[PDB]
Design a protein that fits this description.
The complex is a heteroheptamer, with two copies of chain A, one copy of chain B (about 220 residues) and four copies of chain C. Chain A has about 100 residues and is α+β, with helices and mostly antiparallel strands. Chain A has one domain: 2-Layer Sandwich (Alpha-Beta Plaits), CATH 3.30.70. Chain A contains two helices and five strands; from the N terminus they run E-H-E-E-H-E-E. In chain A, strands 2-3-1-4 form a four-stranded antiparallel sheet. The radius of gyration of chain A is 15 Å and the shape is globular. With about 220 residues, chain B is of the alpha+beta class. Chain B contains eight helices and nine strands. Chain B has a six-stranded mixed sheet with strand order 2-3-6-7-8-9, covered by helices on one side. Chain B has a three-stranded mixed sheet with strand order 1-5-4. Chain C has about 350 residues and is an alpha/beta fold. Chain C has helices at about 55-60, 90-95, 100-130, 135-155, 160-170, 175, 205-225, 245, 250-265, 285-300, 315-330, and strands at about 5-10, 15-20, 25, 35, 40-45, 50, 65-70, 75-80, 275, 280-285, 305, 310-315. The relative contact order of chain C is 0.11. Classes of the chains: A alpha+beta (about 100), B alpha+beta (about 220), C alpha/beta (about 350). The interface of B and F includes residues 29, 30 and 207 of B. Strand 4 (about 65-70) of chain A pairs antiparallel with strand 5 of chain E. The structure holds manganese (II) ion. The site of manganese (II) ion has 4 residues of chain B, from strand 7. The structure holds four DNA strands. The PDB classes it as hydrolase/dna. The entry lists the keywords CRISPR Cas adaptation type I-C, HYDROLASE-DNA complex.
DNA sequence: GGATTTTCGCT
DNA sequence: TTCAATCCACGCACCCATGAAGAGGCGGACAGCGAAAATCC
DNA sequence: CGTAGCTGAGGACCACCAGTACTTTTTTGAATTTTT
DNA sequence: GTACTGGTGGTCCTCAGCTACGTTTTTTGTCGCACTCTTCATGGGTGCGTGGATTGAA
């Protein structure tokens, strides 16, 4: 439980009807998880929610035209994720004080 | 006598020779080398923090880096990484610059301070090199530790001088008979970078003349 | 199951919570502060004047996520409650068990038994670690007399009796509370659990924690489908919202008083973190509040072992399980409610 | 909006409820559309994708006012309240009366009396409106029959009798009902009825109207605090909102069948939108259902007068207000529950 | 370690300021060296620990701080059962027979 | 992993003709009349094998020579057409030791003893493994008799003194082992029946796979030996015919038996290859097929990743490293850290 | 373009190379530039970014011809060989000769005689060229001394004696060297040799030249297969190419000192390009270093004649051809190592 | 004829 | 006369497919309703 | 106000196209508050 | 043939703004009672590092 998975997508938006597909995929993949970078999302999900997300997302895209990769890490991602730049992102285990 | 000056040994070899005692042997007799993560870190810091052709005439002190040193009593060549000249009345003048100062050598490593020898040894050698060039009184030395970002001063005693003289004599002797020695491996000698050729398990194991006849009985 | 989900705190005033798909976004005059996915939240708490989009309230109410509004010093206001989701037989059973003094006094028996057990055993533990600071003897003294009351509470058949005994456990423990502190005694105005709702120093923390627990247990109970802040055990008096916390009275003494005492003893809060108004009310500084909330979440994350089966469980699940078991007893599978006993 | 019943019924969409001093202000796109006091209100019902100013939420929470939020049409979105007031005692009373049978029989006979009154008067007006081609004496005889049945229902004492007289009334109604519609009588009427997947177009469109009234009545109950799944006349059962069905049967008169005849007559609906799949099923065409829902909204906008309160209102508020009186019955302020009754 | 991990790199440089095309080209060239690309502005590569340390050091010395972004993900050793592909952007795999 | 000797990097086989191996920074790119066919990072490779007419830019070979990434060229049937060899490194101690030792015949014998001892032990132990698991098959006693014969011969080989004697005993063992090598066609028809040796044309089957296995093993032993620091063209045994990888042959004399021909026998007995794949020209000896070549290389690179435990060093290491660590265990005996070189005695 | 002693060097950069029939063909952007038979070649040496042609690669590797690919500045890049690799008996012969005094002293004699002859003839030539600014008597006296010393070294048989004679010759040339400079003596004065941390300007310059030349000669050896780290006069130690230092004695003077003195006398550079160090050490500036490298490259294209064979060839091929002759000494028909006796 | 029993489409 | 590295079993630390509980809704088997329509007497 | 569709105006990523280039010292560098 | 620097253009992503709406829900006798959906918890593998018995020497 509580896997921190990574989703990347590259949708061809300039073939026949790309813009609609890109917008729908962006909204769908922002429904689950959080924004990190252009065409790079991370989510904190269980197995069932991830399977549901994959089933929902494999239909909005149109195959043979675009690409979509899903990576998974495990339970102790704090040792794995490392950052150097200037695009900070919250980690959804902090005290979360606003 | 250039050939006499030719037969000098790199100072880092003398630093290594106060260690696993084969790292120097591998690195200066068989001409082999590898790279661990910590070697990469140390090499990067040494490269970044050292650039020649520049000097800082602040007035309070004069710091010069990448200064070649060549000591003849010990037959040691090397490159001192930090030399600090500080205003003094009894110090000797430096060539090419007016005034007189006292010279302090400083070499900066990466890592926590070592409880035993290693570093200190090398530092002492540094002073002797300057003793054979600027011929003065070098009784102080600062080490700049990076993992803690601070300085530690170590006084120099003649016992360390005798120690390093005898050590350099033996280390120079090992070239005459190019015989890499052995020593107990211990558990510390893991993070060695030369382990892929160092082979600790091959040093304290039974002879092959037993194994090759044993499994041959059947 | 339900691994403890997170919780979102909002303090800065004049913000706005808005829905977008399954994400909650914070705005303030069309300035997106941030968006959080709502599939890994358990509750949302707001300070000051913060509003919510009615679509968001509908979404959270449907999907079992509790919205709560607060003001400055945790003065409870405007809980978000949804609708009736079914399992009507369970509500039938619970509504029949009430207004009948036999089952009511059984449940009161178990509740106050748990409370007394926790208080006594915690006091003995504290006198067991470091005996130099306080007098062990007197502490031990209190122990046995509480043990005495234990036998009495088990030989009980009337609710009107137990209330009286409550006072004893409410006057045979306060005399120890003032001696509970170790450090910073002179600075922290420490008059024991002598309390004042309009605030007279120290108890700011008390009230804060009380209200905090009250909300967690209410959400945990409503997830299963019953309401017990004024139910079968507690008095019918309106405005005495404690039975929901009486399910965790067993914990009210443990998980809130212990937290306050650990913060005080571990010298992690300084007296400059509080202030008093002109009239005499006492408030907490914003940085101190952030420190308290960080500590509260970090403590709630720590993981322990439950007595019943030993499956390795977390602290935030302590109220929830106490609700779930209360279901299984009302289904008739067990004999009487097993409370939480540490 | 603010009925004599202490509730607020803001229905116009996009109206920002906000707070000025100690009063509520209804903003209609940035100007002060309305202003109301809060001294005598008890609950607020809000339709439409809107908001509430957090000041209003804070002012309402403390002084025992619940803020219920629903959508434009009606599908209980959420409720905001502090220490809950006026739900625990009401729901416990609901369950207690659900346990016993005498009060349940009394309430069910009240409801059936209301239904028979409604249907009888509907036939009276139907035969008065068009006294040219209609069996006037037959409808008079049916009227006397249902008058006697109304007296008997008012003289009822047990459930079994109730369910029975229900069945009877139902058959009689189907029977007479076939002859009621005026226009398009030769189209696709009914000789048979299904409480299950229907045959004949009229029966299916009655089913659709019943479903819409179902959702409306369910929200009507949910917005006040009562349950859904335990009824008074209908017996309790997991998954069936029995109280919802009881109120459905009470209000199945003017609000459902009159809409049916209006849609059938006036030539506002055609036979091109109705289909058949091997079992009599009337698959509603998408355009047909769009027109149906638009007509339903338009009818909901129509103004009428409450027979009991007398205050002018819309059709869309007829259920909720009616259901709300049920609450005031269970709180001890009412002696009975007349939906449409003389007394 | 010597586990031959499959590390993932995401770089995000900014070309709206003075540090634009030069930085983007240099980062692209210094990241493509140790691995192939799978999608525009992402990289995956099989690496030991020392090469990874050298790569991270080089990139953290190359890009300008407070204006860019760089993320490194370490899947681990048993990676073949974690990478999941859906679309139609094939990538070569270097722990296979690899015949051309 | 404790010793963590190295890591078994992969290997590239290019088969399509008329390509061009170009270099872009650290990447090897396969161009073909300006059309790009692919690119691979060069830190994840060990050797690159080319088939047919594949040219290389001088920058690429110059980059590959200095990091012990070997490059090999083959025409159609794994011939020794051309390799790449780099500069010489400054490790004169090992090279001086090797040349001086090779100048002394007594040390030549003291090394060839261990080489042939390991070889015959490999032969005997594999023969006994084959016999004990296939009960109902061939004379379960001819194999046994050859087994005690080889046990007899080995102790005597251990005690040899001059090179000619050791050559004689090696030949005796070779013939007395081929006598029973001719006996394994367990699960395939007669077209895989061994009937002797033909050197330049693989006129039959079996030879057409043993030749491929031997070439692909020689090109690995040579690379390992030139990586460790030794020179691989002067030998402790064999007649020193000029310009032949003599030391590579010496070091392969031990893993040839258990690492190449065992592999071919496993390939045949599992029926992973069918006789329809091969073909023949007017004379044409026997030439394999492109799908047949692909299957051979896939099975080879798949087996090269099995994890075993090494007998002497006592570590869990992959199969393909064995021709490397052995060489490393060899060039250190030269510094005197052991008593004598332990051959592989799987 | 040029074939010297059965080898083929392609010195002009950017010229592709291929096979036609049984011959080698040079090309430069689809322009036929040269055709050469491959019947009697022994090796191929390239300098450009050519790549050769795979047909020729297979052809030569089949016909026992190895290929060596360098860069245009002489650095070693790769060596394509088949089974032979060529240098096995040669390398064994070197290793066998490296551990005996007689043959090592013979080869050291061959080197030193060439060194002293070149030095003496350069001295006499400079005496002849410039009358006024010269102490003619000192140079003629040293010339007679050096002639006698050469005649003596011709008959040496012990390493120590030859080392002593080399030392004396070095002392003589060094005590003569300073007045060779005829311009800009203000800071360009030679008064000793200090290889490690070089001091006072000109010394450093000299050192740099040696290094480059050594590297060049080093690559030269690797062309033929001589093991660069096992010397003949100089004793072997790890990390130093002893044989390169042995070989580059004969070419040190005429090819490095002449170049440095030409740079100094022609005012090709000024002392402003040398920076200071505190202990007296001297370094070079990047601009000065690049100018030095460019001048070296340009001088490398000067065209002279070969004293021993006569072909007119560039300066840059002198270290290779000599090295080739060295190889032909180790296993061939050479009677004795031919030094670069160049008047 | 007359209990009465079944048949039969609605709560 | 005790010894001094070696394998060898050996345990141990988690993961995972899957098989069995609560909430849930499904059709059937009696409850019913009164006529009617005979069904029979 | 949330949910959809529609344009737009930009900041990122990468594939090409073209034009002036191509040789450097020597020594340095980690280890049980973890190293597969 | 490479490595490095300019420039050009075509193609991906995210915000901004305008336009129209928002949600589409095919029954309900009671009574246990065999079925289905959804969701939480275990007897198999699969390693992955380690003390316990074994003897050839000092
Ligand atoms: Mn340093």
């Amino acid at each position: 439980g509580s896997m921190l998975v990574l989703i990347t997508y590259d949708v061809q938006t300039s073939s026949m009807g790309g813009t609609k597909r890109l917008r729908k995929v962006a909204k769908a993949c922002q429904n689950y998880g959080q924004r990190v970078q252009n065409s790079v999302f991370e989510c904190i999900v269980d197995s069932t929610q991830l399977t549901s997300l994959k089933l929902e997302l494999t239909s909005l895209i149109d195959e043979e035209k675009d690409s979509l990769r899903i990576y998974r890490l495990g339970n102790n991602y704090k040792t794995k994720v490392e950052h150097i730049g200037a695009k900070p992102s919250i980690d959804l285990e902090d005290p979360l004080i606003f | 006598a250039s050939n006499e000056e030719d037969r000098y040994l790199m100072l880092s070899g003398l630093q290594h020779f106060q260690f696993c005692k084969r790292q120097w042997a591998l690195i200066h007799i068989e001409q082999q080398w590898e790279e661990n993560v910590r070697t990469i870190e140390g090499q990067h810091l040494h490269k970044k923090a050292d650039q020649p052709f520049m000097k800082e005439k602040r007035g309070s002190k004069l710091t010069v880096r990448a200064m070649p040193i060549q000591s003849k009593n010990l037959q040691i060549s090397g490159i001192c990484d930090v030399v600090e000249f500080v205003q003094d009345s009894e110090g000797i003048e430096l060539s090419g610059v007016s005034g007189s100062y006292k010279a302090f050598p400083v070499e900066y490593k990466r890592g926590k301070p070592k409880k035993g020898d290693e570093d200190i040894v090398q530092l002492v050698a540094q002073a002797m090199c300057l003793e054979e060039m600027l011929v003065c009184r070098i009784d102080k030395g600062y080490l700049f530790y990076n993992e803690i970002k601070h300085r530690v001063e170590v006084p120099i005693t003649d016992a360390l001088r005798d120690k390093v003289v005898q050590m350099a004599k033996e280390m120079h002797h090992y070239y005459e008979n190019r015989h890499t020695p052995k020593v107990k491996t211990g558990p510390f000698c893991n993070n060695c970078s030369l382990q892929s050729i160092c082979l600790p398990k091959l040093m304290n194991k039974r002879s092959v003349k037993r194994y090759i006849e044993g499994r041959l009985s059947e | 199951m339900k691994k403890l989900l997170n919780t979102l705190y909002v303090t800065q005033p004049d913000t706005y919570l808005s829905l977008d798909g399954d994400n909650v976004v914070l705005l303030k005059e069309q300035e997106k502060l941030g968006r959080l996915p709502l599939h890994n939240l358990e509750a949302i708490v707001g300070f000051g004047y913060t509003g919510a989009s009615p679509a968001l309230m509908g979404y959270c109410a449907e999907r079992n996520i509790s919205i709560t509004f607060l003001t400055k010093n945790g003065r409870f206001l405007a809980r978000v409650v949804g609708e009736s989701r079914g399992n009507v037989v369970l509500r039938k059973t619970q509504y029949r068990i009430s207004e009948n003094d036999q089952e009511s006094t059984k449940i009161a028996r178990n509740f106050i038994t748990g409370k007394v057990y926790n208080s006594k055993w915690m006091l003995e533990r504290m006198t067991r670690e470091h005996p130099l600071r306080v007098n062990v003897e007197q502490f031990k003294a209190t122990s046995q007399l509480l043990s005495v009351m234990m036998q009495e509470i088990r030989n009980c058949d009337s609710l009107e009796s137990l209330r009286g005994w409550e006072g004893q456990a409410a006057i045979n423990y306060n005399k120890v509370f003032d001696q509970m502190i170790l450090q910073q005694k002179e600075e922290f105005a420490f008059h024991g659990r002598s309390r004042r709702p309009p605030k007279d120093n120290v108890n700011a923390m008390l009230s804060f924690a009380y209200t905090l627990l009250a909300n967690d247990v209410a959400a945990a109970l409503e997830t299963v489908g019953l309401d017990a802040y004024v139910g079968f055990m507690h008095q019918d008096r309106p405005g005495r919202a404690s039975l929901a916390l009486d399910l965790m009275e067993e914990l009210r003494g443990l998980y809130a008083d212990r937290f306050v005492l650990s913060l005080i003893n571990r010298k992690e809060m300084t007296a400059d973190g509080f202030y008093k108004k002109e009239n005499g009310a006492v408030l907490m500084t914003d940085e101190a509040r952030k420190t308290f909330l960080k500590a509260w979440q970090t403590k709630k994350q720590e993981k322990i072992t439950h007595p019943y089966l030993g499956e390795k469980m977390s602290w935030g699940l302590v109220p929830y399980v106490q609700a779930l078991l209360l279901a299984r007893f009302l289904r008739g599978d067990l004999d009487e409610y097993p409370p939480f006993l540490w």
